[PDB]
Model the fold of this input.
Amino acid sequence: HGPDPENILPIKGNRNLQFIKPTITNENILVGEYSYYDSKRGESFEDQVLYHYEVIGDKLIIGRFCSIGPGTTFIMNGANHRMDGSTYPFHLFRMGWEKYMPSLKDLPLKGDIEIGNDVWIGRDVTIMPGVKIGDGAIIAAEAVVTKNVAPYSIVGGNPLKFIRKRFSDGVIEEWLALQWWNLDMKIINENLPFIINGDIEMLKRKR
Amino acid sequence: HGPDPENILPIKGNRNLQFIKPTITNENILVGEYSYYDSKRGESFEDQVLYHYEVIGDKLIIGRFCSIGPGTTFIMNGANHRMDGSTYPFHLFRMGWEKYMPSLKDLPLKGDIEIGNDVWIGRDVTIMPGVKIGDGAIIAAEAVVTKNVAPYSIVGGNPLKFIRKRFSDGVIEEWLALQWWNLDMKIINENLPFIINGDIEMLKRK
Amino acid sequence: HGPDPENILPIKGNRNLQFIKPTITNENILVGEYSYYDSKRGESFEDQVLYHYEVIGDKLIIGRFCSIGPGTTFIMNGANHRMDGSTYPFHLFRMGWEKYMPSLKDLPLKGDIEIGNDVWIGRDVTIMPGVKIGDGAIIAAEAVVTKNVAPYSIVGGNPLKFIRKRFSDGVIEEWLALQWWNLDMKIINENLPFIINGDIEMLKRK
Ligand SMILES: CC1=C\[C@@H](O)C[C@@H](F)Cc2nc(co2)C(=O)N2CCC[C@@H]2C(=O)O[C@H]([C@H](C)COC(=O)Nc2cc3ccccc3cn2)[C@H](C)/C=C/C(=O)NC\C=C\1
Ligand SMILES: CC1=C\[C@@H](O)C[C@@H](F)Cc2nc(co2)C(=O)N2CCC[C@@H]2C(=O)O[C@H]([C@H](C)COC(=O)Nc2cc3ccccc3cn2)[C@H](C)/C=C/C(=O)NC\C=C\1
Ligand SMILES: CC1=C\[C@@H](O)C[C@@H](F)Cc2nc(co2)C(=O)N2CCC[C@@H]2C(=O)O[C@H]([C@H](C)COC(=O)Nc2cc3ccccc3cn2)[C@H](C)/C=C/C(=O)NC\C=C\1
Ligand SMILES: [Cl-]
Ligand SMILES: [Cl-]
Ligand SMILES: [Mg+2]
Done:
């Protein structure tokens, strides 16, 4: 039948694993249903989002059915200094330095962090500003996601290194055409055997 | 003689550095005598063993005289998702999804983590499932051990990248035949100067 | 005009960001004025300096106008084990092993950690022994600094990899010949518009 995506703690007695969406407080963090964060000590998913400021307007977007490993960190665009000259943020200390407060054109802003659906993000991963992660990708533990990740690619390391693609490009096209995460959830439920077990040529044929 | 291997805190006034073996309470974690964990906040060495589940049956093995740096993490085989089709673990959330429960043969299982003797593991090292680390190797701090490490190798980085060998190939097998760590403690105590000073030819001829 | 460099918490209401120099109680750690540490939970910058023993005598020097990201750790030379033979530190456990203690001629010491002026160090950076980081460099977050960083270099990764230089070789030498961080503070304030916006030629004019 399925659990409730509005239930913050969907596992009996487990107070560390949280469905991300219901916990969110912040307008510009948008996470899909059923995506969870396995906490380390019960900290919120947002507590893992860092350098996130309304002034900049950048968003963190996560798809449906994503796995976020404990300690995964999201570094938003507020982290990058001005690099035209000296990087030191003089204006932060005020006392006559407030005058030199930069505008957003002066900063190296990279865009929103956007993570697709069915992404397995390993433990203690760090995601840097502006990176896109395709559907069905696997981020190895301890990875620092420095660049974009193709759908159904396995990556890892610091800086990020491409390892393998989970399936062929032909099977990858078929998974991206089917987009099971976007189907009505009665249909997800009566095909879950096939989604879990990766027999694309069965769902091939139902549609 | 030397310290008592069953002494959990062998350094007086030090509540952080622990001998691993006498703190172990799990039957799948075999650690040799004298190997120590220099902990950060006084936490257990077992606390660093993650995703370790009895139903998987995988073991963590560590030899004798190993230096395990603070924050070293062991990610066991229970951490890898099913990759046949969808990585998402539906069954954990039950409410009808418990039926789609995967078996040991459905998960990608890589085997035990086996660490050798006289290994120096750095601080904040993460060891991936199923990796083997030979005797007398050095793991640089912050390393992520994603593959096996040959005996007496210096390695580090993420992914792990080979740096160099500590001695020549010939000298490395003079050490692996000697196996000073497997000798009686009274033989070790009488030859500690050369074990520490590295005089392999002396130990060879002793 | 400007913040007082001897002020520990130079941002009103902010208990995390600290000017480093006025918090320093241990000699062999020399940090310049206005160099700050953005702490995660209000922890002292010193607490990030690990394996720092007076018996070894190495120093951590940091210039002025540096930004130290939260969680950045400095691994001092005391962290390196002896590598002639067994890296196991027998003498630490005492009980008859105390008399097999190394001298500093026996250990792989690598010198002081020296970081220049106007360096931007990312979050969770780990800096290893003996590394020198030039003026104006930028360290990517999560980087393990395994080697020296040229001035006005951008670097990152584990192990460290060179990414690119911030300006042309000629403009870099101009910034190094100007040394704005060492100018009298009244001189700096008059020219901060151009220090901050990268207009090197008018700075040379000034
Ligand atoms: C991350 C960082 C260095 C870290 O080592 C250490 C920091 F994380 C510590 C900290 N951060 C903040 C507070 O404490 C902080 O607020 N910001 C960090 C970058 C984004 C944001 C910022 O400053 O945004 C302003 C924006 C226009 C206006 O924001 C204000 O806050 N204005 C303001 C504050 C006042 C306070 C009291 C009285 C009057 C005031 C008037 N105006 C703009 C985009 C600045 C961008 C920039 O320099 N980027 C780089 C950053 C470097
Ligand atoms: C890391 C992870 C997801 C994380 O995002 C989130 C998790 F870490 C959170 C959490 N984990 C657990 C609880 O909370 C948890 O129990 N497991 C995680 C993987 C391994 C295990 C699991 O499910 O295993 C079952 C297995 C049949 C369970 O059923 C049993 O009947 N177990 C059992 C029976 C016993 C009988 C007698 C005495 C002791 C017993 C102990 N266990 C099988 C092998 C594997 C299932 C799978 O899909 N693996 C992949 C998952 C990956
Ligand atoms: C990092 C590590 C293992 C970690 O896994 C676990 C460790 F961090 C745990 C811990 N360390 C200590 C306590 O708990 C500890 O005391 N030390 C670690 C390295 C440095 C030090 C040590 O042993 O030092 C002595 C030294 C002669 C005797 O000790 C003194 O302190 N003597 C002394 C100090 C004086 C100071 C000023 C003036 C006169 C003095 C006279 N005598 C010498 C240099 C030994 C160096 C060595 O074997 N290096 C390797 C390191 C291994
Ligand atoms: Cl320490
Ligand atoms: Cl030194
Ligand atoms: Mg690398």
